[PDB]
Design a protein around this ligand. Structure first.
Ligand SMILES: [Mg+2]
Ligand SMILES: [Mg+2]
Ligand SMILES: [Mg+2]
Ligand SMILES: [Mg+2]
Ligand SMILES: [Mg+2]
Ligand SMILES: [Mg+2]
Ligand SMILES: [Mg+2]
Ligand SMILES: [Mg+2]
Ligand SMILES: [Mg+2]
Ligand SMILES: [Mg+2]
Ligand SMILES: [Mg+2]
Ligand SMILES: [Mg+2]
Ligand SMILES: [Mg+2]
Ligand SMILES: [Mg+2]
Ligand SMILES: [Mg+2]
Ligand SMILES: [Mg+2]
Ligand SMILES: [Mg+2]
Ligand SMILES: [Mg+2]
Ligand SMILES: [Mg+2]
Ligand SMILES: [Mg+2]
Ligand SMILES: [Mg+2]
Ligand SMILES: [Mg+2]
Ligand SMILES: [Mg+2]
Ligand SMILES: [Mg+2]
Ligand SMILES: [Mg+2]
Ligand SMILES: [Mg+2]
Ligand SMILES: [Mg+2]
Ligand SMILES: [Mg+2]
Ligand SMILES: [Mg+2]
Ligand SMILES: [Mg+2]
Ligand SMILES: [Mg+2]
Ligand SMILES: [Mg+2]
Ligand SMILES: [Mg+2]
Ligand SMILES: [Mg+2]
Ligand SMILES: [Mg+2]
Ligand SMILES: [Zn+2]
Lengths: 64, 272, 117, 87, 95
RNA sequence: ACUGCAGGGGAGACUGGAAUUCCUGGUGUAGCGGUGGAAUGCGCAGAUAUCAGGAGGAACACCGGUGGCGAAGGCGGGUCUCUGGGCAGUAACUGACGCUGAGGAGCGAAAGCGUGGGGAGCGAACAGGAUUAGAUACCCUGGUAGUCCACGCCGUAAACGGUGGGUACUAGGUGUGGGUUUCCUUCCUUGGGAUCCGUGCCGUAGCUAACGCAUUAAGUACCCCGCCUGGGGAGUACGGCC
């Protein structure tokens, strides 16, 4: 049910901000694991891809 | 870095001394030593104008270079780190690449064999001298000068350092070690880094005679003098002084800075 | 003598009080009449009635300076948060957009100790 | 720490026969390289208490192997100490 | 020799012509110590998500060096002291 | 030993944003703050509010869970450097090298203590206000040490699973974290079966004074260490060590 486990070899990168427009909310908050169907290993890979994209100004911290 | 003696005598029960570990070549350079003699707090009239000075060990003056103007583009090489009896910092003999000997105040982390650049195209390393226009904001700097060309005057004791806060138009906000905020010119020059020997404030001079070696001389309280000698003098037992605390010349304690001095346009905030 | 047709109303609503200030979009204050300016004193200021009179007093005093349309920026965990917005509509103003700018710390500074009432 | 092309030069000098990785000579000569390497991480970094405990588990495993090789053949214990060090 | 991926956010007042030879004097520090440079992709102007030091635009440059650990810790030091550089982000691509 | 894999394990250096407070200006005018209800307090000498810039410190929203990691204490903003342990598979290697461990040594939340830094917020002591028969308290406005950092000391906690460590065996049912592998294998389902190591919940035999424990035992057994012998006096006196 996880996207990254079914479709293989898709690296979660902090450069790829088009991948990270989803898995964040409208207010710019990281979505939960039970609403995106991710596993434990890739939810950790989404979150470091989002926390790093915020420090390089590719994603906003807060929004409205 | 601070070595403590053992209490073999009553006069060394809590004493300490610097370890002198950073010092090599215990003799100074001969072509850079000038003679000194202590005045003893005496002015040209032969009268004491500063009390409690006098005595002390014989000294000699090391020509320190606070200008650092005429060697832009010429690298240097830290030859030695020496002792200096005139200042609490340590000094560093520089060998320039054209043959000239100079001293500077040694920063924290300028060991023997480093390379020292100078000028507007220098790197931001401890020891290098630049104008404030080229030093970036936030850098801890020392040996700062007040007027362009006037020679370094600020932050040159042991551990002293100035944080550079900003550069607006043609001035630079500094935070001096007191906490004062002052706005000096951006063409003033400054050396990167904090001044070394930053652990000598914790020295316990052991006995009374050791501050006689350093040129200090005893200090009589005013509440044990007579009234002819001090405003706090007199009393039949012992007193607190019969009045509010003053100088021996009768000046009450308070602000002694001139209130309309010409440099109030530069000071941004007074110390706390 | 300040004249501006479009404005921005800010509402802060705590457990003790409400304050309705009205600014231009540049952020300069025009009128600010709160729940102590409208006559109340003590625990009565937190009531929803004291919020629908503070919002009326800031609205008529802002329409004299030409304000015809505002943006609403409420904040604070108060009970006069909804009745103050409906009070601006029955005073001749247009609300446009209603936002929420309540400050949310990212576990920064320490809160005070909890009340043992 | 101690990559694959780094432990081979220890096993050539101290191992018995070209693949011997588990002998008392082979295990001690690897542990002495790990212990003597972990002390430079404990001369810088004096406050790494979670790594200094790992040094005590490599000392205690080494001293049991030194005790084992000094029971079964004392001739092997003499030549192993002189090439590495004890006391 | 370890892989790295350095992302540098340059000041937008610079022109898009002098963006490549300005980074060459920094990437010559790598080549004096044995490491080599692979991909110096420049993305150009892109709108930021928040304002970094009173600028709302930034120029994105990806460096992709492959050098020693001591030279990359020297490279981001000189990149931080340069005044045309707003941010610096050094990340490894290996495991 | 080799190949893989998961992780807030630790240490150092650099660094990112929201928020609190203060400072400097802009607009603006009489209140703000606070409570069960008030008052002390702040303000009218331009406060609270609203906008913009600047200084500083501390903690890291969302991810975050019923979850991971560590011997316990404990551990999460990001990045680089250095570093410890664990698990699965291959069965290449040594050939009982094992387990426990009196004394001993190391680590050891918070408070505290020494020298020097730093100090936004919080806040023992403190002060004023209210409550009350009183209020050395609860509640409110203030507020010092301390909380933070560096290097040392202290070595105590309901330091707890109130359950010492190793091993062998004894029905299962059902979640979740890390592996490897067989069957419809490309019917893709990341479902089903097998096995190894964590972590919970419910349950049979058995045990228990009962509550309850129950393949993570408090069951059936063997090896080693600590400790108990009615309640107070008391983890106190004297002596000794730190
Ligand atoms: Mg991963
Ligand atoms: Mg004369
Ligand atoms: Mg004197
Ligand atoms: Mg007398
Ligand atoms: Mg006389
Ligand atoms: Mg007199
Ligand atoms: Mg007297
Ligand atoms: Mg008397
Ligand atoms: Mg970690
Ligand atoms: Mg801020
Ligand atoms: Mg402050
Ligand atoms: Mg103001
Ligand atoms: Mg304000
Ligand atoms: Mg960290
Ligand atoms: Mg054999
Ligand atoms: Mg043991
Ligand atoms: Mg503490
Ligand atoms: Mg005390
Ligand atoms: Mg202390
Ligand atoms: Mg102190
Ligand atoms: Mg009181
Ligand atoms: Mg209180
Ligand atoms: Mg530290
Ligand atoms: Mg200790
Ligand atoms: Mg105890
Ligand atoms: Mg605990
Ligand atoms: Mg117990
Ligand atoms: Mg047991
Ligand atoms: Mg064991
Ligand atoms: Mg299990
Ligand atoms: Mg049960
Ligand atoms: Mg029992
Ligand atoms: Mg008894
Ligand atoms: Mg006792
Ligand atoms: Mg005693
Ligand atoms: Zn996944």
């Amino acid at each position: 049910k996880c996207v990254f486990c079914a479709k293989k070899d898709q690296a979660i990168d902090y450069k790829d901000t088009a991948l990270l427009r989803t898995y964040i909310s409208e207010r710019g908050k990281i979505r939960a694991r039970r609403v995106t169907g991710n596993c434990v290993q890739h939810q950790r890979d989404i979150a470091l891809a989002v926390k790093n994209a915020r420090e390089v100004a590719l994603l906003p911290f807060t929004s409205s | 870095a601070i070595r403590k003696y053992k209490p073999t005598t009553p006069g060394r029960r809590g004493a300490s001394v610097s370890d002198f570990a950073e010092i090599t070549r215990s003799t100074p350079e001969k072509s850079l030593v000038r003679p000194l003699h202590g005045r003893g707090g005496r002015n040209a009239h032969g009268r004491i104008t500063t009390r409690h000075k006098g005595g002390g060990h014989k000294r000699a003056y090391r020509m320190i270079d606070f200008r650092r103007n005429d060697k832009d583009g010429v690298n240097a090489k830290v030859a030695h780190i020496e002792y200096d009896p005139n200042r609490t910092a340590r000094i560093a003999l520089l060998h320039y690449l054209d043959g000239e000997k100079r001293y500077i105040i040694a920063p924290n982390g300028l060991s023997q064999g480093d390379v020292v650049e100078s000028g507007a195209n220098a790197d931001i390393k401890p020891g290098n001298n630049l104008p404030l226009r080229n030093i970036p904001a936030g850098t801890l700097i020392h040996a700062v000068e007040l007027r362009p060309g006037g020679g370094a005057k600020l932050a040159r004791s042991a551990g002293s350092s100035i944080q550079l806060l900003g550069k607006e138009a043609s001035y630079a906000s500094l935070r001096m070690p007191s906490g004062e905020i002052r706005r000096v010119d951006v063409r003033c020059r400054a050396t990167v880094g904090e001044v070394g020997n930053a652990e000598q404030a914790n020295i316990n001079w052991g006995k009374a005679g050791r501050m006689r070696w350093k040129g200090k001389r005893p200090s009589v309280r005013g509440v044990v003098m007579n009234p002819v000698d001090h405003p706090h003098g007199g009393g039949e037992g012992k007193t607190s002084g019969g009045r509010h605390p003053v100088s021996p010349w009768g000046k009450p304690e308070g602000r002694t800075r001139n209130a309309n001095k010409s440099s109030n346009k530069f000071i941004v905030r007074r110390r706390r | 003598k300040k004249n501006v047709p479009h404005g921005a109303a800010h509402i802060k609503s705590t457990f003790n009080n409400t304050i309705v200030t009205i600014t231009d979009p540049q952020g300069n204050v025009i009128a600010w009449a709160s729940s102590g300016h409208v006559g109340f004193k003590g625990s009565r200021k937190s009531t929803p009635f004291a919020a629908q009179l503070a919002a009326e007093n800031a609205a008529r005093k802002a329409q004299d300076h030409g304000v015809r349309k505002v943006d609403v920026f409420v904040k604070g965990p108060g009970s006069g948060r909804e009745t103050a917005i409906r009070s601006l509509q029955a005073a001749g103003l247009e609300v446009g957009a209603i936002s929420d700018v309540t400050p949310q710390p990212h576990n920064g500074v320490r809160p005070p100790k909890r009340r043992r009432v | 720490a101690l990559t694959a092309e780094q432990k081979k030069e220890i096993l050539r000098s101290y191992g018995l026969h070209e693949t011997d990785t588990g002998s008392p000579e082979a295990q001690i000569a690897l542990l002495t390289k790990r212990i003597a390497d972990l002390t430079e991480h404990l001369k810088v970094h004096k406050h790494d208490h979670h790594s200094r405990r790992g040094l005590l588990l490599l000392v205690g495993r080494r001293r049991r192997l030194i005790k084992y090789i000094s029971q079964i053949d004392v001739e092997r214990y003499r030549s192993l100490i002189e090439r590495l060090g004890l006391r | 020799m370890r892989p790295y991926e350095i992302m540098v956010i340059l000041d937008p007042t610079l022109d898009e012509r002098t963006v490549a030879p300005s980074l060459e004097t920094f990437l010559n520090v790598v080549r004096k110590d044995g490491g080599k440079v692979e991909k110096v992709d420049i993305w150009g102007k892109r709108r930021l998500a928040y304002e970094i030091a009173k600028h709302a635009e930034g120029i994105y440059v990806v460096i992709d060096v492959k050098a020693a650990p001591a030279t990359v810790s020297e490279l981001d030091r000189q990149l931080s002291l340069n005044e045309s550089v707003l941010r610096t982000k050094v990340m490894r691509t290996d495991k």
